[PDB]
Amino acid sequence: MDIIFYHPTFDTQWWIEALRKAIPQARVRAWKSGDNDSADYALVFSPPVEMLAGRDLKAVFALGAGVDSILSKLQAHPEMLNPSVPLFRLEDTGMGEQMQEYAVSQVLHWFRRFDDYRIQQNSSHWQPLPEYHREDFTIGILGAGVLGSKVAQSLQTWRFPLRCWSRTRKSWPGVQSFAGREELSAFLSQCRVLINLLPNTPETVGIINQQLLEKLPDGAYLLNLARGVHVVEDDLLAALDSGKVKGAMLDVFNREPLPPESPLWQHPRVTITPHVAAITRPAEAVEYISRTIAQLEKGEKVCGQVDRARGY
Amino acid sequence: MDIIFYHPTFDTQWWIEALRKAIPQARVRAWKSGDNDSADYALVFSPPVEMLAGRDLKAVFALGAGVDSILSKLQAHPEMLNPSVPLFRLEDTGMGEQMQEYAVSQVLHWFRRFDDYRIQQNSSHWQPLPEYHREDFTIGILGAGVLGSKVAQSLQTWRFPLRCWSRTRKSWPGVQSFAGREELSAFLSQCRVLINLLPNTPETVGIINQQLLEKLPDGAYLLNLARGVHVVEDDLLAALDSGKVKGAMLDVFNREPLPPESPLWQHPRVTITPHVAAITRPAEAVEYISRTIAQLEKGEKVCGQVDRARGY
Ligand SMILES: NC(=O)c1ccc[n+]([C@@H]2O[C@H](COP(=O)([O-])OP(=O)(O)OC[C@H]3O[C@@H](n4cnc5c(N)ncnc54)[C@H](OP(=O)(O)O)[C@@H]3O)[C@@H](O)[C@H]2O)c1
Ligand SMILES: NC(=O)c1ccc[n+]([C@@H]2O[C@H](COP(=O)([O-])OP(=O)(O)OC[C@H]3O[C@@H](n4cnc5c(N)ncnc54)[C@H](OP(=O)(O)O)[C@@H]3O)[C@@H](O)[C@H]2O)c1
Ligand code: NA
Ligand code: NA
Ligand code: NA
Numbered sequence: 037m038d039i040i041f042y043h044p045t046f047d048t049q050w051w052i053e054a055l056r057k058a059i060p061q062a063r064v065r066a067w068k069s070g071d072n073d074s075a076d077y078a079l080v081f082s083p084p085v086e087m088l089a090g091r092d093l094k095a096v097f098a099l100g101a102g103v104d105s106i107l108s109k110l111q112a113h114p115e116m117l118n119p120s121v122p123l124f125r126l127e128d129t130g131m132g133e134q135m136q137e138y139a140v141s142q143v144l145h146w147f148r149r150f151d152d153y154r155i156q157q158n159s160s161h162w163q164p165l166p167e168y169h170r171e172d173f174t175i176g177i178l179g180a181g182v183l184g185s186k187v188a189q190s191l192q193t194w195r196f197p198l199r200c201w202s203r204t205r206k207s208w209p210g211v212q213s214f215a216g217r218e219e220l221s222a223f224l225s226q227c228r229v230l231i232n233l234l235p236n237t238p239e240t241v242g243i244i245n246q247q248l249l250e251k252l253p254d255g256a257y258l259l260n261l262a263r264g265v266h267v268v269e270d271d272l273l274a275a276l277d278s279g280k281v282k283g284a285m286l287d288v289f290n291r292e293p294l295p296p297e298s299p300l301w302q303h304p305r306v307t308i309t310p311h312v313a314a315i316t317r318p319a320e321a322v323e324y325i326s327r328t329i330a331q332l333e334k335g336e337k338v339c340g341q342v343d344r345a346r347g348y
Numbered sequence: 349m350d351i352i353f354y355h356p357t358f359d360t361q362w363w364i365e366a367l368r369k370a371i372p373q374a375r376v377r378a379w380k381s382g383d384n385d386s387a388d389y390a391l392v393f394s395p396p397v398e399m400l401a402g403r404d405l406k407a408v409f410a411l412g413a414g415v416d417s418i419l420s421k422l423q424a425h426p427e428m429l430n431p432s433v434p435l436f437r438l439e440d441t442g443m444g445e446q447m448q449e450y451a452v453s454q455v456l457h458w459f460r461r462f463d464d465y466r467i468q469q470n471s472s473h474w475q476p477l478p479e480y481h482r483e484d485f486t487i488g489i490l491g492a493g494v495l496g497s498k499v500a501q502s503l504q505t506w507r508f509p510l511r512c513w514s515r516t517r518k519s520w521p522g523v524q525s526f527a528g529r530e531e532l533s534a535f536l537s538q539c540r541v542l543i544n545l546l547p548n549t550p551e552t553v554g555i556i557n558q559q560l561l562e563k564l565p566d567g568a569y570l571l572n573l574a575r576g577v578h579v580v581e582d583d584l585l586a587a588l589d590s591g592k593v594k595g596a597m598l599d600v601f602n603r604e605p606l607p608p609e610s611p612l613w614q615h616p617r618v619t620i621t622p623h624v625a626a627i628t629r630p631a632e633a634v635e636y637i638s639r640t641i642a643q644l645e646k647g648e649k650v651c652g653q654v655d656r657a658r659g660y
C-alpha cells in the first residue's frame with residue numbers, strides 16, 4: 037500500500053518514519069504539489085484541494101478530532117473528495133485524557149474558590165470563604181461524544197452531579213442525559229458549570245448566546261473547550277458583567293489568535309489559553325491509524341467515521 | 349455515658365445535637381468554665397487546661413487532623429492530661445478528599461502550564477507553550493500518612509510518577525517509598541512537585557529550607573498543605589527568585605493570618621489560600637467519633653491514636 041501524508045506544522049519526518057515502522061508493508065511519502073502518483077490512504081490536516089481531488093482513495097484520515105474545516109472546504113470544493121471516499125478522524129488518541137486534565141483541574145479550581153482567593157491575594161487580603169457543596173455544583177457537558185464522555189467519567193470520580201446534552205440519548209449510569217433542542221432549556225437550568233465539547237456545525241454555531249446564558253443558574257461557570265464560533269463573545273461579556281456568569285475559561289475564540297483589542301484578555305473573570313486544550317499525541321495517533329487500516333483490511337467494523345451529511 | 353464538648357468557633361449546638369442523635373445513650377453538654385461534673389469522653393479543640401486537668405477520662409478526641417497545639421499545650425502544662433488518658437484525632441473525616449481536590453487541581457494546573465498562560469494573559473499575549481511530560485513530572489509527598497496516601501492515590505489515577513517520604517517504609521505499589529533523614533536527599537532529587545503533608549513536630553520544624561530546596565530539580569513546585577513552621581519563608585523566597593522553584597502554592601504560614609508585609613502576597617510565582625486546604629466535615633466527624641467510642645466499648649482495635657512521645 038501507498039500512504040501520502042500532509043500536515044502544515046507537524047514534524048513530517050517523524051510521522052513518516054513512525055508510520056513506516058507501524059505499517060511495514062506501506063510506502064509512506066510526504067505529499068507535495070505536483071504528486072499525482074497513486075495512493076491508497078491520505079493522512080491530512082488542512083489539505084489543499086489538489087491533494088485529494090479526483091483520487092479514489094480507500095480512506096482519508098483527518099489528523100484531528102474536529103473536522104469542521106475539511107468539511108467546509110469540501111463544501112466549497114465538492115470535487116475535493118469523491119463521495120465513495122470514507123473520511124476518518126482522530127478519536128481520542130490522547131485527547132480524552134488531556135480534556136480530562138483541563139476539565140478536572142478548572143472545575144476543582146472553581147469549586148474550591150481558588151479564583152476568589154486569587155482576587156483576594158491581589159489585595160494582600162486574608163479571608164476564608166464559605167465552602168461550596170456538590171449538590172449545588174451540577175456539571176453539564178454540552179457534547180456527549182468521545183471527549184464529552186471522557187470528561188464526564190473523570191468528573192464522576194469526584195462525585196459531582198452530572199448531566200449531558202446531545203442529539204441522541206445516552207445510557208451513562210449516574211449522568212442524566214438530555215437530547216434535542218426541545219430539552220436544551222431543561223438541561224441548562226441546573227448547570228452550575230457548563231462545559232462545551234460540541235463540534236462546529238451549522239446547527240451549533242452561536243449556540244452559547246444571551247438566550248442560552250440566561251437559562252443558566254446564577255454564578256455559573258463556562259468552560260469552552262470546543263470551537264470559538266459556539267460563543268457569542270459580546271453576550272458572554274454581558275453575562276460576566278451582570279454576575280450571571282461568575283467565571284469563564286476559554287481555550288478557543290471566534291478569531292485566533294484572539295485579537296488584543298478583545299475585552300476577554302483583561303476581564304477579571306476570564307481565563308484564556310491559546311487553543312491548547314487537547315492536541316493529538318503522535319504515537320497514539322499512529323497506533324490508531326495503523327490499527328484502523330488493519331481493521332479496514334480485515335473487514336471488521338471501525339465506526340470512527342465522519343458523517344458528511346450530518347456535519348461531524 | 350457523659351460527653352463534654354468544646355470548640356472555639358464551630359456550631360456547638362449543631363454538634364451537640366448531632367452527637368446525641370448518633371449516640372442516644374450519651375448525655376452531651378457544652379463545657380464551660382466551672383463545670384467539674386463527670387465526663388467519660390471529651391471532644392476538644394484548643395481546650396483550656398481547666399477542662400481536662402485531673403480528669404480520668406476514657407478518651408479525648410481532638411477535633412482536627414493536626415494535634416501539634418494540644419501536644420505543645422500539654423507540654424507546657426503536664427497536669428492537663430493524665431498519662432492514662434488516650435488521645436484521638438480526626439483521621440480523614442472528609443479531609444482526605446479535600447486534600448485530593450486541592451492537590452490534583454494544582455498539580456494539573458502546573459502540569460498544563462496554566463500559571464504561565466496566566467502570566468501571558470496579563471500582557472494580552474497569545475502563545476502556545478511546549479507541553480510537559482509525565483516522566484519529567486515526578487511528584488514527591490513529604491508525609492505518607494492518612495492524608496499523604498489519599499493524595500498519592502488520587503495522583504496515581506493521573507499516571508504521574510510518585511514517591512513518598514516518611515519515618516517507616518510504605519508498601520504502596522507504584523509509589524517509591526523513602527524513609528529517614530538518611531534517604532531524604534535521594535527522595536528530593538527527583539521531586540518536580542513537592543507536596544508537604546508532614547505533621548508539626550520538633551524533628552520537622554524548618555525542614556523546607558535552603559538545604560532542602562537546593563536538592564530539588566530546577567523549576568520545582570512547592571505545595572505546602574501541612575504547617576507553616578515547616579517552611580523557612582526567606583529560603584523559599586530566595587529559591588523562587590533564583591528560578592530553583594518555578595512556583596509555590598501555600599495554604600499555611602509561620603504567622604496566620606499571613607502579615608501583609610510578607611513578600612509572599614505579591615510575589616508573581618506564589619499562590620496563597622488562607623489555611624482552608626482541608627477542614628473536617630462535621631457529619632463525617634460525628635460518625636467517626638461515635639464509631640470509635642463504639643469500638644472502644646467493644647474491645648476492638650481503633651489505632652487512630654496519637655503517640656504523645658512520638659509527637660503526632
Ligand atoms: N484543543 C481543543 O480545544 C480541541 C481538541 C479536540 C477537539 N476539540 C473539539 O471537541 C469537539 C468534540 O470532539 P469529540 O471527539 O468529542 O466529538 P464527537 O465524539 O463527534 O462528539 C460530538 C458530540 O456533540 C453532539 N452534537 C453534535 N451536534 C449536535 C446538535 N445539533 N445538538 C446536540 N448535540 C450535538 C453529538 O451528539 P450525538 O452523540 O447524539 O451524535 C456528540 O455527542 C470536536 O468537534 C472539536 O471541535 C477541541
Ligand atoms: N487545612 C490544612 O492545611 C490541614 C488540614 C488537615 C491536616 N493538615 C496537616 O496535615 C498533616 C498530616 O495529617 P495526616 O492525618 O496525614 O497525619 P498522619 O497520618 O499522622 O501522617 C503523618 C506522616 O508524616 C510522617 N512523619 C512524621 N514525622 C516524620 C519525620 N521526622 N520524618 C519523616 N516523616 C515523618 C509520618 O511517617 P510514618 O508513616 O512513618 O509515621 C506520617 O507518614 C497534619 O499533621 C496537619 O498538620 C493540614
Ligand atoms: Na508535508
Ligand atoms: Na479539520
Ligand atoms: Na460536599
Ligand code: NA
Pocket residue numbers: 353354355356360378379
Ligand atoms: Na463550647
Ligand code: NA
Pocket residue numbers: 394410412414415416417418419
Ligand atoms: Na491541636
Ligand code: NA
Pocket residue numbers: 480481482483
Ligand atoms: Na505524557
